[PDB]
C-alpha cells in the first residue's frame with residue numbers, strides 16, 4: 001500500500017496472508033486474500049498461475065506482520081486451490097482474476113471467528129456501492145513502487161470508487177476496464193495498492209454491511225495520476241464463486 | 248526477478 005496507515009489485523013480481520021513454501025523449506029509471501037466463509041479464502045488467480053499446486057501454499061488468518069508471528073494468528077494448509085479457467089492478461093489488464101482457496105488446519109478445522117479473525121460478507125448479485133463511495137484496501141504490498149523491501153506490518157488505506165465512464169476515458173484505461181472490474185483510487189493520486197497487495201480486499205459499506213466489493217487485480221504503476229487500481233468486481237462473480245464452493 | 252519474487256504479476260511487478 002502506498003500512503004495510508006499501518007494497521008493491525010483486528011481492523012481488517014478477514015485479511016488472509018498467503019505464503020509459498022520453496023524446495024529447501026524457506027517460505028515467502030505470495031499475495032493477500034479474504035476470508036469469505038470459515039473454510040474459504042478468495043484471492044486473485046495471477047498470484048498462483050505460475051505455481052498452481054495447492055501443496056506449496058500456507059494461509060495465515062489473524063496475522064498482522066509479514067515475516068513474524070503475531071498472537072491470535074492461525075495457520076492453514078490449502079485443501080483446494082481453484083483458479084479461474086478463463087484467466088488471461090494483456091500487457092496491463094487481468095481478466096477473470098479470481099481464485100478460491102479452501103483452507104484446513106492440520107487438525108482438520110476451518111477458521112473460527114475471534115478478535116483477529118472474521119469473515120467478510122459477499123455482495124448480493126450485481127449489488128455495488130455508487131461511484132464516489134469511499135472503500136478500504138489492505139495488504140503487505142510495497143509502500144513505494146521503487147522499493148525492493150515489503151513493509152513488515154500490515155497497512156490499509158482509503159480509496160474512492162471511480163465510475164466506469166471516468167475509468168474508460170482514454171487518459172485513464174480506456175476499453176481495458178470491463179463491467180467485470182471496478183476502478184478505485186485516491187482523488188489526489190497519493191494512496192493506492194501496489195505489488196504485493198494483489199488478491200487482497202477492497203471493502204465497502206454496502207446496504208450497511210462491510211462487503212467484499214473488489215479483489216486487488218491490476219493497474220499501471222502504483223499511485224500514478226489517472227491510473228486507478230483495478231479490482232475484480234465480486235458481485236459479478238457470484239455464480240463462479242457459488243459453483244466452486246458447494247459443500 | 249527470481250522464484251522468491253512476491254506477487255510477480257502484480258501491479259508494477261516484472262510480469263504485471
Ligand SMILES: *Cc1cc(C*)cc(C*)c1
Pocket residue numbers: 050248249250252255256261262
Ligand atoms: C521472475 C518472474 C517471476 C514471475 C512469477 C513472473 C515473471 C514474468 C518473472
Ligand SMILES: [N]
Pocket residue numbers: 091092261262263
Ligand atoms: N505487466
